[PDB]
Amino acid sequence: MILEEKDASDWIYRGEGGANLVLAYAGSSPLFVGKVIRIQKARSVLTSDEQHLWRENNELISSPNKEVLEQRYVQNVIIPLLGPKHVDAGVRVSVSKEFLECVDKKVTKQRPLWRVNAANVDTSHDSALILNDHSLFSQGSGGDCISVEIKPKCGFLPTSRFIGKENMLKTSVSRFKMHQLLKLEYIEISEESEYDPLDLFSGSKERVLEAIKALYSTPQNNFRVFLNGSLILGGSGESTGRTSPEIGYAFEDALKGFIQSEDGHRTECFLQLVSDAVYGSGVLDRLLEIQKLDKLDIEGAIHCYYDIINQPCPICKEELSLHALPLDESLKIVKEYLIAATAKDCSIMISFQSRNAWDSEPSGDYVSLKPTNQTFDYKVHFIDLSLKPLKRMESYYKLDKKIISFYNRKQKAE
Ligand SMILES: O=P(O)(O)O[C@@H]1[C@@H](OP(=O)(O)O)[C@H](OP(=O)(O)O)[C@H](O)[C@H](OP(=O)(O)O)[C@H]1OP(=O)(O)O
Ligand SMILES: Nc1ncnc2c1ncn2[C@@H]1O[C@H](COP(=O)(O)OP(=O)(O)NP(=O)(O)O)[C@@H](O)[C@H]1O
Ligand SMILES: [Mg+2]
C-alpha cells in the first residue's frame, strides 16, 4: 500500500513528459509486475474559477489531491467519451517522501538535462499513479511484445468565424507544421519534422502509411517503439533527432524474429504493420472527435475565458457575439476547449504480439502482414489524458499569437 525508500531500487526510468515522470517496475512483487508508476513533477487542488468550470462533475471538485483529480477526470469525463476499452484511469498508491526523493535521485542521470532544469518530482504529494504498462501485451504471455507510441497532436484545421484577418493561414496550415518553424527558431529541435497530423487523421490508408513513415524518419517526441518495455526507437523523456543510418540499423536489428522477413526488410514491414493497425482500428477517428471540441479556436474561446473569470476582456478593445452568451454556455465552451486540449496532447500506445492460437478466446483485433505471412494481435490504449488547468487559457492565446505571427513573418519572406 505504501512505497518506501528501499522499494525505489525496483523502479527504472521509462520516460517523462512536461508533467509526469514515469518509471517501469523491474521487481517481483505481484502488485507491480507489469505496471508503471506515474509521478507528478513540480514546475487548493482546484482554483475557485475551476470549481465553477467543473461544477457538473462534483466528485471532481471534491478531489482531495491532484492524483485523485486526474484519476476522476479520466474516469468521469474522458471515459464516457472514448469508452473504457482503450483507457485506464489508474490506481493510486501511497508513496513516502523518501521514496519519491530516492526515485528522483536514482533516475536523475538518465533524464535530459533540460527536463531536470525545468522540474522535479513533487516530493510533497503523498500519492502516485499506478498504471498498466502497455508495453506489456496483456496483464498477468504470448512471447515478445513490440509496442508503438504515437503522440498524434491536433489532426484538424480550425475553420472559425473568430480567426483574425491577419491569421487566416491557420485555416490552411496545420498548427503542428507552423509550430515546427517556431521550435526550430527557438532551438528546441534541429530539423523540421516530416510528420503531418492531417495525413495520420485523414482516414486514408495511403496517407496514414505516409504519416507512419514520416514519424519513423523524424520521430521527435511523436513516435517511440519498445521491445518488451525497452526503448528501441524514439526519445527518452524528450524529442529525438532525425533517424540516422546508425539508428536505422539498431532498430532493424532489434526487430529480429518478431517481424519474420529478410535482414534489411523488417523495418518496412513493421511500418506497414503499424499503419494497418492504426487505420484498421479506427482509434484516431474517436480521438479526433474529442479534439474537435475546440469548436471556435483559441481566438474565439479566449473571449469566453475572460467572461468566466469575470475580467474585462483585454482582447477586445475600445466580439459582441461571444460576450453576449449566458455564463452556462461560456463555461461549456471553455470546458470543452480544455477537454480538447487533453485529446490534442495525449498519446496512443499500440501493443503487438504474434497471434496466439491457444488464446481461450481468440482476439477480434489483429493484422495480417502480406509478405511475412504473420498475424499479429494488437491492442490500443490512450495514455497521458491529463487535466489541463483553466488558467492556461491565457498562455494558449499568447503561444498561438506567437506561432501565427512568426509563421506570417516567415512567409512574408517570399
Ligand atoms: O501546446 P503544445 O501543443 O506545444 O503542447 C505542449 C507539449 O509540446 P509539444 O508541442 O507537444 O512538443 C509539451 O511537450 P514537451 O514538454 O515539449 O515534450 C507538453 O506535453 C505540454 O503539456 P503539459 O505542460 O505537460 O501539460 C503541452 O502543452 P498543452 O498545450 O498540452 O498544455
Ligand atoms: N500506462 C503506460 N504504459 C506504458 N508507458 C507509459 C504509460 N504511461 C506513460 N508511459 C510512458 O512514459 C512517458 C511519459 O508519460 P506521460 O503520461 O506522457 O507523461 P507526461 O509528462 O504526462 N506527458 P505530457 O504532459 O503530454 O508532455 C510516455 O511518453 C510513455 O512512453
Ligand atoms: Mg500530461
Ligand SMILES: [Zn+2]
Ligand atoms: Zn473579448
